[PDB]
Amino acid sequence: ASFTCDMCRAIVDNVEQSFKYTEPTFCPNPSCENRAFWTLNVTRSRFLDWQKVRIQENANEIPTGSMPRTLDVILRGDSVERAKPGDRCKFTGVEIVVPDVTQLGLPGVKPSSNSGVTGLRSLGVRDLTYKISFLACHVISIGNERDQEVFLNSLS
Amino acid sequence: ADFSLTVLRARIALLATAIGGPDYTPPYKLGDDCLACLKDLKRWFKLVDDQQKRWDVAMAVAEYRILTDDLLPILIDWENKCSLAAKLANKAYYDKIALNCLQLLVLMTWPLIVTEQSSSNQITLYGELKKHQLVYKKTILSMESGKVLRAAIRLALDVIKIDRLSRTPRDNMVLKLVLNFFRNVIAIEPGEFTINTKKSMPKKGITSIDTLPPNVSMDDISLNTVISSFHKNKVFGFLLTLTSSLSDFINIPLLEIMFYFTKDVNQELLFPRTSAGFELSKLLQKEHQMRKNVIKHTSARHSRFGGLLSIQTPDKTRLTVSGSQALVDEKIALQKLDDSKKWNKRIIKKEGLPNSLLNSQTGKAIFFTESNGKHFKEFINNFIDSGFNILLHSVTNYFTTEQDRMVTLEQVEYLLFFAWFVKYQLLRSKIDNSADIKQVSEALKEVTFILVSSLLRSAYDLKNWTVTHAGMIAFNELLNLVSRTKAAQDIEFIVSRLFSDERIQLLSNLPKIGSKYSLQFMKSCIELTHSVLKVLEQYSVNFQKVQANYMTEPVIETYINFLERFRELEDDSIKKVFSFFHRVFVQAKEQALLFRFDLIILLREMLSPDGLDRMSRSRKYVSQFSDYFLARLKKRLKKSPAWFVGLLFPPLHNSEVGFYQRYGE
Amino acid sequence: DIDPLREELTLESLSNVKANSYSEWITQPNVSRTIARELKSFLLEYTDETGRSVYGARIRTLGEMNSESLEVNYRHLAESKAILALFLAKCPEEMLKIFDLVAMEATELHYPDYARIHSEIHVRISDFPTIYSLRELRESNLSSLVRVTGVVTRRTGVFPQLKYVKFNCLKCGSILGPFFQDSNEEIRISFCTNCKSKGPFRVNGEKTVYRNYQRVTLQEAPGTVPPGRLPRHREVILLADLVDVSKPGEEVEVTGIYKNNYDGNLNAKNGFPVFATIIEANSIKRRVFSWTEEEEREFRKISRDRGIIDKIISSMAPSIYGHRDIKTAVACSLFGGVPKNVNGKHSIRGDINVLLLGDPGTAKSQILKYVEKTAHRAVFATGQGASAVGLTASVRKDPITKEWTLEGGALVLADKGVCLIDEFDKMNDQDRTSIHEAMEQQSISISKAGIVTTLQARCSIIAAANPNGGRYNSTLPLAQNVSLTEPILSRFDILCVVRDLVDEEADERLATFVVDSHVRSHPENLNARQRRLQRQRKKEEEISPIPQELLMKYIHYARTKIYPKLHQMDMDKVSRVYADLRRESISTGSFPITVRHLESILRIAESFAKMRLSEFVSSYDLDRAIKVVVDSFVDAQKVSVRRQLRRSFAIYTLGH
DNA sequence: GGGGGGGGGGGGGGGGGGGGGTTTGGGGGGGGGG
DNA sequence: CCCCCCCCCCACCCCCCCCCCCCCCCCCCCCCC
Ligand SMILES: Nc1ncnc2c1ncn2[C@@H]1O[C@H](COP(=O)(O)OP(=O)(O)NP(=O)(O)O)[C@@H](O)[C@H]1O
Ligand SMILES: [Mg+2]
Ligand SMILES: [Zn+2]
Ligand SMILES: [Zn+2]
B196 to chain A, minimum CA–CA distance in Å? Answer: 4
**Resolution, in Å, please?**
3.2
- A123 lies in a domain? no
Give the DSSP letter string of C73-98.
Answer: EHHHHHHSSHHHHHHHHH-HHHHHHH
Same domain, A26 and A76: no
- Domain identity same for A86 and A133: yes
What separation in Å is there between the alpha carbon of C366 and the centre of ligand 1?
Answer: 6
Residue in B closest to A18 by C-alpha: B207
Q: Residue A30 is nearest to which of B194, B207, B213, comparing CB atoms?
A: B194
- The reply to whether A9 and A69 lie within a common domain is no
In CATH, the architecture of C288-652 is 3-Layer(aba) Sandwich (3.40)
- Residues A91, A137, single domain; the answer is yes
CA of B560 to C1' of D9 (A): 27
Q: Does B129 touch chain A (CB under 8 A)?
A: no
Using the CA of B346, give the nucleotide whose C1' is nearest: D11
Count of other CB atoms within 10 angstroms of residue C13: 20
Chain B residue with CA closest to C29: the answer is B10
Nearest to A49 among C23, C138, C228 (CB): C138
Q: CB distance C272–A74 less than 8 Å?
A: yes
**Which CA-bearing residue is nearest the C1' of E16?**
A125
| Cβ–Cβ below 8 Å for B17 and C13 | yes
The SS3 assignment for C467 reads coil
Positive or negative, the CA dihedral B198, B199, B205, B210 is negative
Contact between C212 and C162 (Cβ < 8 Å): no
CB–CB of B207 and A122 under 8 A? no
Q: Give the integer Cα–Cα distance in Å for C624 and C630.
A: 10
Residue B665's Cα: distance from chain center in Å?
A: 50
CB C61 within 8 A of CB C55: no
Q: Mark yes or no for CB contact A19/C190 under 8 Å.
A: no
Q: Do C143 and A21 touch (CB under 8 A)?
A: no
CA distance C636 to C648: 15
DSSP string, C158-196: -EEEEEEEEEEESSSS-EEEEEE--SSS----SSBTTTT
- Answer yes or no: do A90 and A139 share one domain: yes
- What is the pairing mode between strands C354-358 and C494-498? parallel
Q: Is B29 on the interface with C (CB under 8 A)?
A: no
* CB distance C470 to ligand 1 below 6 Å: no
Cβ-contact A73, A82 below 8 angstroms = no
CA distance C484 to B89: 102
Nucleotide nearest to C450 (CA to C1'): D24
A129 touching chain B per CB within 8 A:
no
Do A40 and A61 fall within a single domain?
A: no
Determine, for residues C18 and B69 on separate chains, whether the beta-carbon distance falls below 8 Å. Answer: yes
The reply to whether residue C142 touches residue A42, judged by beta carbons under 8 angstroms, is yes
Tell me C115's DSSP state.
Answer: G
A57 and A95 part of one domain: yes
Cα atoms in the 13 Å half-sphere on the side-chain side of C100:
15
Q: Check residue C442 and report its DSSP letter.
A: S
**Helix H or strand E segment including A71:** strand A70-76
Residue B586 CA to chain centroid, in angstroms?
35
Residue A43 and residue A53 in one domain: no
Q: What residues does each domain of chain C span? A: 29-130, 131-162+210-287, 163-209, 288-652
Listed residues A11, A32, A48: the one ending a domain:
A48
Q: Which of A16, A46, A121 sits opposite B204 (nearest CB)?
A: A121
Q: Which positions on strand E lie below 7 Å from a protein C-beta? A: 4, 11, 15-21, 26-28
Ligand 1 neighbourhood includes C464 CB (under 6 angstroms): yes
Indicate whether A80 belongs to any domain: yes
Return the axis-axis angle of helices C364-374 and C324-335, rounded to nearest 10°.
30
Q: Which domain holds residue A5?
A: 1-48
Give the Å distance between the CA of A107 and the centre of ligand 3. 20
Query: Cα separation of C282 and C242, whole Å?
Result: 8
CA C342 to chain centre: 31
Q: How far is the CA of C258 from the centre of ligand 3 (A)?
A: 30
SS3 A10: coil
The whole-number Å distance from C393's CA to D24's C1' is 15
Q: Are C364 and C323 in contact (CB under 8 A)?
A: no
Q: Residues A55, A83: one domain?
A: yes
Residue nearest to atom 15 of ligand 1 (CA): C363
**Closest by CA position to C316, among listed C379, C368, C360, C365:** C368
Residue A156 domain-assigned (yes or no): no
DSSP notation for B294-362: HHHTS-SS-GGG---EEEE-SSS-EEEE--TTGGG-HHHHHHHHHHT------------S--STTTS-T
C contacts of B66 (beta carbons < 8 Å): 18
Q: Which of B3, B17, B43, B207 is the best mutation test for C, with the most CBs of C within 10 A?
A: B17
The verdict on residue A139 lying in a domain is yes
- Tell me which chains share at least 3 CB pairs under 8 Å with chain C: A, B
Neighbours of ion ligand 2 (CB under 5 A): C 364-365
For ligand 1, atom 30, the nearest C-alpha belongs to C363
Q: Could you tell me if residue A78 is inside a domain?
A: yes
Strands C175-180 and B318-321: unpaired
User: Which ligand 1 atom is at minimum distance from the Cα of C362?
Assistant: 21
| A36: nearest nucleotide, CA–C1' criterion | E18
Q: B566: Cβ–Cβ under 8 A, 6 or more apart, which residues?
A: B574, B602, B605, B606, B611, B612
The rounded distance, in Å, linking the Cα atoms of A72 and B560 is 53
In contact, C69 and C42? CB cutoff 8 Å: no
Instruction: Kindly give the distance from the C-alpha atom of residue C32 to the centroid of ligand 3, in angstroms, as a whole number.
Output: 28
As a rounded value in angstroms, the CA-to-C1' distance for C234 and D19 is 35
Indicate the burial class of C25 (C-beta count within 10 angstroms; 0-12, 13-18, 19 or more): buried
Instruction: Tell me whether residue A150 is in a domain.
Output: no
- Alpha-carbon distances, residue A125 vs A36, A104, A120 (angstroms): 22, 11, 9
Residue contact C264–A109, C-beta within 8 A: yes
Closest CA to C198 of C176, C167, C168, C171: C171
Is A135 in the same domain as A88? yes
* Same domain assignment for residues A95 and A137: yes
Phi, psi of C247 (to 5 degrees): -135, 155
User: Does A62 share its domain with A135?
Assistant: yes
Q: Does residue A149 fall inside a structural domain?
A: no
B630 contacts B603 by C-beta, under 8 angstroms: no
A 10 A CB-CB count for C352 gives 25
Q: Which CA-bearing residue is nearest the C1' of E27?
A: B348
The sign one gets for the Cα dihedral B387, B389, B393, B395 is positive
Chain C residues inside the 8 Å CB shell of B14: 2, 7, 9, 30
Find the nucleotide nearest C399 (Cα to C1′): E11
Looking up residue A58, the CATH number of its domain turns out to be 2.40.50.140
* Cα-to-centroid distance, A37 and ligand 3 (Å): 9
* A113 located within any domain: no
Pick the CATH number of C29-130 from 3.30.1640.10, 3.20.20.70, 3.40.640.10, 3.40.1280.10: 3.30.1640.10
Q: Which residues touch strand D (CB under 7 A)?
A: A 110, 113; B 344, 346, 348-349, 653; C 387-390, 394-395, 397, 448-449
Sorted by sequence, the CB contacts under 8 Å of residue B352 that are 6+ apart come out as B113, B114, B115, B408, B409
Per DSSP bridges, beta strands C418-422 and C378-382 are: parallel
Q: How many domains are there within chain A?
A: 2
- Which of A52, A101, A106 has the highest number of chain C CBs within 10 A, making it the mutation to test binding with C? A101
Partner-chain residue, chosen from C23, C228, C275, that has the shortest CB–CB distance to A84: C228
Spatial contact of B49 and B57, defined as CB atoms under 8 Å apart: yes
Within 8 A of A98 by CB-CB distance, chain C residues are: 271-272
Q: How many CB atoms lie within 10 A of CB B447?
A: 13
A10 C-alpha to center of ligand 3: Å?
A: 6
Distance between first and last Cα of chain A: 45
Q: The sheet that has A89-99: what strands, in order across it? A: A50-56, A70-76, A130-141, A89-99
Strand D: which bases are under 7 Å from protein Cβ? Answer: 2-3, 9-12, 20-21, 23-28
